[PDB]
Design a protein around this motif. Structure first.
Motif, PDB file in Angstrom:
ATOM      1  N   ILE G  19       0.813  -1.207   0.000  1.00  0.00           N
ATOM      2  CA  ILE G  19       0.000   0.000   0.000  1.00  0.00           C
ATOM      3  C   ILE G  19       0.846   1.256   0.000  1.00  0.00           C
ATOM      4  O   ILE G  19       0.377   2.313  -0.476  1.00  0.00           O
ATOM      5  CB  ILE G  19      -0.956  -0.056   1.220  1.00  0.00           C
ATOM      6  N   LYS G  22       4.474   2.925   4.641  1.00  0.00           N
ATOM      7  CA  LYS G  22       5.727   3.478   5.159  1.00  0.00           C
ATOM      8  C   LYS G  22       6.085   3.007   6.568  1.00  0.00           C
ATOM      9  O   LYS G  22       7.059   3.511   7.156  1.00  0.00           O
ATOM     10  CB  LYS G  22       5.720   5.004   5.110  1.00  0.00           C
ATOM     11  N   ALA G  37       5.968   7.136  -3.009  1.00  0.00           N
ATOM     12  CA  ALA G  37       4.647   6.638  -3.340  1.00  0.00           C
ATOM     13  C   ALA G  37       3.882   7.617  -4.209  1.00  0.00           C
ATOM     14  O   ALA G  37       3.863   8.817  -3.929  1.00  0.00           O
ATOM     15  CB  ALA G  37       3.850   6.383  -2.084  1.00  0.00           C
ATOM     16  N   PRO G  39      -0.158   7.501  -6.369  1.00  0.00           N
ATOM     17  CA  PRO G  39      -1.287   6.770  -6.938  1.00  0.00           C
ATOM     18  C   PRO G  39      -1.271   6.819  -8.458  1.00  0.00           C
ATOM     19  O   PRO G  39      -0.847   7.795  -9.076  1.00  0.00           O
ATOM     20  CB  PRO G  39      -2.504   7.515  -6.382  1.00  0.00           C
ATOM     21  N   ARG G  49       8.601   3.786  -5.891  1.00  0.00           N
ATOM     22  CA  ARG G  49       9.946   3.278  -5.696  1.00  0.00           C
ATOM     23  C   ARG G  49      10.026   2.635  -4.331  1.00  0.00           C
ATOM     24  O   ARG G  49       9.634   3.247  -3.336  1.00  0.00           O
ATOM     25  CB  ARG G  49      10.989   4.387  -5.788  1.00  0.00           C
ATOM     26  N   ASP G  51      12.842   0.421  -2.111  1.00  0.00           N
ATOM     27  CA  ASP G  51      14.244   0.051  -2.138  1.00  0.00           C
ATOM     28  C   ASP G  51      14.655  -0.572  -0.820  1.00  0.00           C
ATOM     29  O   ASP G  51      14.320  -0.046   0.245  1.00  0.00           O
ATOM     30  CB  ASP G  51      15.118   1.266  -2.400  1.00  0.00           C
TER      31      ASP G  51
END
Ligand SMILES: Cc1cc2nc3c(=O)[nH]c(=O)nc-3n(C[C@H](O)[C@H](O)[C@H](O)COP(=O)(O)O)c2cc1C
Ligand code: SF4
Ligand code: SF4
Ligand code: SF4
Ligand code: SF4
Ligand code: SF4
Ligand code: FES
Ligand code: FES
Lengths: 430, 54, 212, 66, 41, 230, 59
Positions: G19, G22, G37, G39, G49, G51
């Motif tokens: 989603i 975080k 992030a 949408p 992204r 990582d």
């Protein structure tokens, strides 16, 4: 003193319960309305306040505050703003049946009551909030107010003295909490019906911030007969902290469900048996007793065979008092489904200022639906006891209180029947 | 674990089906639980010796 | 129960709504009652007049009442969605309300719901596939000392039986509106035996009063 | 350029100290050598509100919705 | 005397309430003004 | 000379006449947890979180709108004060859904902070939990009215500072939708100042909506441009 | 219950399960997680992204 008393005629305060001899200004003049009221209202408002505080009138409508002290709160001196009297004629509380029959059968005594109440506190006009479901009786009350004005009798030069006093009729639009004390005041302003916070009291801030007050129709109608009739002869009925002829009425499982006007102190068992037919199947067949209407916990049989119908006796029995549902419910019906329907009623009729009443009546209604199905464990029912201990005293109005009490009463008295319900469903599942 | 969802995280079942467990999970892993102010010292018997932490 | 407008024409102003100047005479009476400074308070009786002048109220009526009483329309929508009289769905001429909460269910309200159901045909909440028979079950109306009771438009029906219900059904289909009173004897709220209540005609100004 | 990260040649750009008064802040800033700016404290002003004032008669302070 | 003396409300139509209040508008003490004509004048 | 005595836990302090309990508690150092109150908005008694116990009285009274009478003694750390706060924090999280991942107010929801610091640990009310269909105020304001705690903070703000009168409550019981009845795109000035009014993630910024989360974003002092005031 | 490869999952016959909430960047004790992030064209929230430094991952 008295040995708790019984029914006796000419101790009835107001006549014309149903189908009596006539109704008109002439019928009211024959029965005893508009009799020498100029002599009374040309004397002084503090005389009526002393008369009411002599009478020991208990404020009807299930609040519990005395009438005379409330009206003495209204006796702030003359400022630069007008003052109103609001006569609340609502019947919420399913059972209520209080003043529907009264306002259909004697409005002139109500006009007497609001006129004396307005004179007794220097009010300028009166608004009568009738329930919007009562359109025919609102028309009848309009006819009576028309005839009262048409005698030139209230308004300008009301009963000889230069004292302007009007009465208006405002319908409701269909609600429950308009019966309550301050959501009434906002709904008369045209706003959506929602109560105010109590520590700004209505005796200072009312209809847009005029010092008004609210009174119930039983108290209003009984008020001028305290003036024109015997000083504390009205107080000679039952007890002294609380007294009066109240409308003890039965709608439920009896023969001929009906109304009686009786003394405040009376055995409820002899009331139920000896004034409305009898309990269907005898006395021994019935399950339980609710007084109060709908904001009052239930009573089992062995308790109610000792109950006298006083406020202090019912607070000793940990209940309150109200109108026309002082009834039994019989054994063959499900008191679980009865109280669940009462909680569904509260969910369909409640406003939504307070977070806790909204969410609590939601939990209580879904939990009682589960209990009607019988699909929980006993930890849930003691949690229901816990939440009904959490709601009371945390709301603006007292509909949260009236929702929290019958759950409390059901868990106080009918614990094992609920346990058996849950056990029956467990064996149904298994 | 403890009987306190303000220090230990709630487990998965009540996490996925509660509300307050998801709240305490989320703030417990982001913010960290608060610890009252004070200075403490303790020591255990590690196999080396008196392992102290202050 | 559909608290969002969602235009869908046969709604969506301007749908033509219009009063009569005789209704303007009524509104002169209603805002003659209230004190000046609070013209914004007649929303409830003026809006009820709109409901009685058009049996279900449109939103064009709500904007027109908002134009007259000089309030912004959102307060009018608040009042029109809060209460229970104001039926925003289009309904028929006659509006049957089976009143059923605590004493009414306790005295076999389900007989009356099932009678109106399998005589009228359509289910509760919804309406008939014509006009004049919108049936709903409603909360307490007040008159609890009688049967599980029937409200039609501004009329009560008390102390019931299924056969006089069938008479009400057929006479509303034809057009005979029966009496407002109850049925099966005891023409008002009565102890329906032999008057355990007051019997003697009261005197009034001919007995003792206290100094007035 | 390899990841889109934020590489910075700033060793001191992630220090933030918490003090208790402005005078100790000034004293420490002069003691440890570097310059400093003093953005002065702006507390919320006290006001006076009451629900009875919210429901006045001729005065226009009126919530008109509740 | 057991004859029901109401059901004079038998003939009331949908508008008799507002027509009755409309006929009952005059001889009324003047229902005073207060400050501005509205909260937004 | 208009200095009234209260005892916050025994400590005396002198209070202005006709002010609330809450202003006195903020004067001495406490904070009562509060939702529907806001210091630039008119006082409402909706949220029922400002509760506190006053001695020698059974009823727990609200303290967003109690004017200070003479000589109080306020129990901010008694038993039933914390019990009432626990009860109401249990009620406010009953009909509030599981959106704390996909919310825009992870670190900055009021309900999460006050639920940890003031409420229970385990929930109840196994069934139920109503849902509300969302509206569309405009392209600036993403609106998920399921998270709306029905607090009535945005309505008072609109009707007293914006004056537009487009946000009202509609309905009864549990079913109270807050907003616009008529699908009107509420667009005005100060419409951006309502994503900061709404204490929960019910009214959120659309052009920010799903880009960050407040603890990563470091804060930096600045002065506005493009207006004469800054 | 071993800790190895750092895979991601997805819904049964469906799209991705993340989603970009975080939490994992907030709890990664060497802060090897990095999430940016956005949408997409639907409206459901997603990423851009994601990582992991396998050097800084301490498992
Ligand atoms: C839940 C609730 C329901 C009420 N319903 C009614 C009602 O139907 N009719 C009414 O006149 N008063 C009703 N009241 C108000 C009480 O009768 C209260 O006594 C009233 O404000 C003043 O009455 P009094 O003259 O006896 O003091 C209600 C109050 C509450 C809390
Ligand atoms: S308890 Fe419920 S019904 Fe009563 S004022 Fe509060 S929100 Fe309204
Ligand atoms: S507003 Fe609702 S979804 Fe968002 S963080 Fe708060 S409780 Fe969670
Ligand atoms: S949208 Fe936000 S500010 Fe408005 S009533 Fe709901 S929670 Fe309160
Ligand atoms: S951001 Fe990290 S913790 Fe959150 S859903 Fe995605 S992988 Fe899981
Ligand atoms: S170091 Fe590795 S295992 Fe630990 S939180 Fe970070 S990515 Fe996950
Ligand atoms: S419940 Fe049907 S009349 Fe009161
Ligand atoms: S602050 Fe919400 S009730 Fe006082």
């Amino acid at each position: 003193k008295t040995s708790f008393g019984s029914l006796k005629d000419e101790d009835r305060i107001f006549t014309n319960l149903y189908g009596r001899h006539d109704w008109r200004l002439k019928g009211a003049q024959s029965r005893g309305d508009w009799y020498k009221t100029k002599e009374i209202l040309l004397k002084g408002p503090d005389w009526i306040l002393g008369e009411v505080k002599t009478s020991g009138l208990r404020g009807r409508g299930g609040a519990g505050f005395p009438t005379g002290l409330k009206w003495s709160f209204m006796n702030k001196p003359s400022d630069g703003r007008p003052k109103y009297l609001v006569v609340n004629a609502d019947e919420g509380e399913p059972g209520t049946c209080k003043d529907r029959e009264i306002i259909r059968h004697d409005p002139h005594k109500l006009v007497e009551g609001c006129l004396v109440g307005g004179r007794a506190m220097g009010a300028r006009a009166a608004y009568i909030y009738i329930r919007g479901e009562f359109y025919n009786e609102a028309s009848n009350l309009q006819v009576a107010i028309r005839e009262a004005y048409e005698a030139g009798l209230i308004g300008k030069n009301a009963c000889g003295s230069g004292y302007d006093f009007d009465v208006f009729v405002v319908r409701g639009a269909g609600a429950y909490i308009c019966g309550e004390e301050t959501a009434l005041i906002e709904s008369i302003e045209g706003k959506q019906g929602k109560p105010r916070l109590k520590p700004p009291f209505p005796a200072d801030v009312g209809v847009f911030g005029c010092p008004t007050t609210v009174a119930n129709v039983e108290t209003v109608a009984v008020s001028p007969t305290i003036c024109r009739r015997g000083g504390a002869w009205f107080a000679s009925f039952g007890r002294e902290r609380n007294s009066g002829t109240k409308l003890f009425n039965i709608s439920g499982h009896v023969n001929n469900p009906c109304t009686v006007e009786e003394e405040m102190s009376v055995p409820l068992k002899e009331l139920i048996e000896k004034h409305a037919g009898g309990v269907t199947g005898g006395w021994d067949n019935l399950l339980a007793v609710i007084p109060g209407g709908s904001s009052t916990p239930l009573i089992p049989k062995s308790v109610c065979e000792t109950v006298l119908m006083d406020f202090d006796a019912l607070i000793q029995a940990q209940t309150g008092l109200g109108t026309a549902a002082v009834i039994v419910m019989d054994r063959s019906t499900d008191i679980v489904k009865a109280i669940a329907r009462l909680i569904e009623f509260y969910k369909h009729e409640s406003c939504g200022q307070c977070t806790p009443c909204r969410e609590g009546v939601d939990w209580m209604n879904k939990v009682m639906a589960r209990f009607v199905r019988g699909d929980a464990r006993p930890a849930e029912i003691d949690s229901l006891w816990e939440i009904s201990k959490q709601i009371e005293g945390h709301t603006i109005c007292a509909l949260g209180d009236g929702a929290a009490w019958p759950v409390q009463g059901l868990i106080r008295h009918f614990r094992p029947e609920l346990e058996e319900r849950m056990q029956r469903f467990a064996q149904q599942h298994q | 674990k403890v009987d306190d969802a303000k220090v230990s995280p709630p487990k998965r079942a009540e996490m996925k089906t509660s509300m307050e467990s998801l709240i305490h999970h989320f703030k417990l892993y982001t913010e960290g639980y608060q610890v009252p102010p004070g200075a403490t010292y303790t020591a255990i018997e590690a196999p080396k010796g008196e392992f102290g932490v202050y | 129960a559909l608290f969002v407008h969602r235009d869908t024409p046969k709604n969506n102003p301007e749908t033509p709504f219009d009063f009569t100047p005789e209704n303007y005479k009524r509104i002169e009476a209603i805002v003659k009652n209230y004190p000046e400074g609070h013209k914004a308070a007649a929303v409830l009786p003026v809006l009820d007049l709109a409901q009685r002048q058009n049996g279900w109220l449109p939103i064009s009526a709500m904007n027109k009442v908002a134009e007259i009483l000089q309030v912004p329309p959102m307060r009018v929508y608040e009042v029109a969605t809060f209460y229970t009289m104001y039926n925003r769905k289009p309904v028929g001429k006659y509006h049957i309300q089976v009143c059923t909460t605590t004493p009414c269910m306790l005295r076999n309200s389900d007989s009356i719901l099932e009678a109106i159901q399998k005589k009228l045909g359509i289910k509760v909440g919804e309406t008939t596939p014509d006009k004049l028979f919108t049936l709903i079950e409603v909360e307490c109306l007040g008159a609890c000392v009688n049967a599980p009771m029937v409200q039609i438009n501004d009329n009560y029906y008390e102390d019931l039986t299924p056969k006089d219900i069938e008479e009400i059904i057929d006479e509303l289909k034809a057009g005979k509106i029966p009496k407002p009173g109850p049925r099966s004897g005891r023409f008002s709220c009565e102890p329906a035996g032999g008057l355990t209540s007051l019997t003697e005609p009261p005197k009034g100004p001919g007995f003792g009063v206290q100094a007035g | 350029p390899l990841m889109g990260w934020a590489s910075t040649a700033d060793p001191l750009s992630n220090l933030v100290l918490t003090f208790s008064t402005k005078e100790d802040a000034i004293a420490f800033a002069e003691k440890n050598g570097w310059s400093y700016d003093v953005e002065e404290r702006k507390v919320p002003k006290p006001k006076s509100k009451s629900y009875g004032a919210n429901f006045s008669w001729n005065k226009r302070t009126r919530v008109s919705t509740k | 005397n057991t004859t029901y003396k109401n059901l004079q409300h038998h003939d009331y139509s949908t508008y008799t309430f507002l027509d009755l209040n409309l006929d009952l508008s005059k001889f009324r003490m003047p229902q005073p003004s207060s400050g501005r004509e509205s909260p937004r004048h | 000379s208009n200095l009234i005595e209260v005892f916050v836990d025994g400590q005396s302090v002198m209070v202005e006449p006709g002010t609330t309990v809450l202003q006195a508690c903020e004067k001495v150092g406490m904070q009562i947890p509060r939702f529907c109150y806001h210091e630039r908005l008119s006082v409402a008694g909706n949220c029922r979180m400002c509760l506190v116990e006053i001695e020698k009285a059974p009823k727990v009274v609200a303290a967003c709108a109690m004017p200070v009478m003479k000589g109080w003694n306020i129990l901010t750390n008694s038993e039933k004060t914390k019990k009432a706060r626990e009860g109401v924090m249990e009620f406010l999280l009953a009909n509030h859904p599981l959106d704390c991942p996909i919310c825009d107010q992870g670190g900055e929801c009021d309900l999460q902070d006050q639920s940890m610091m003031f409420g229970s640990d385990r929930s109840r009310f196994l069934e139920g939990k109503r849902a509300v269909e969302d509206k569309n105020i405009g392209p600036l304001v993403k609106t998920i009215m399921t998270r709306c705690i029905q607090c009535t903070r945005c309505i008072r703000f609109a009707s007293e500072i914006a004056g537009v009168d487009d946000l009202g409550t509609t309905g009864r019981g549990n079913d109270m939708q807050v907003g616009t009845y008529i699908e009107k795109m509420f667009m005005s000035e100060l419409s951006g100042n309502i994503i900061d009014i709404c204490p929960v993630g019910a009214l959120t910024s659309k052009p920010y909506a799903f880009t960050a989360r407040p603890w990563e974003t470091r804060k930096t002092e600045s002065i506005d441009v493009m207006d004469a005031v800054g | 219950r071993f800790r190895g490869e750092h895979a991601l999952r997805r819904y049964p016959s469906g799209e991705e399960r993340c989603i970009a909430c975080k939490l994992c960047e907030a709890v990664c004790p060497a802060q090897a997680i990095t999430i940016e992030a956005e949408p997409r064209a639907d409206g459901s929230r997603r990423t851009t992204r994601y990582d992991i430094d396998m050097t800084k991952c301490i498992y």
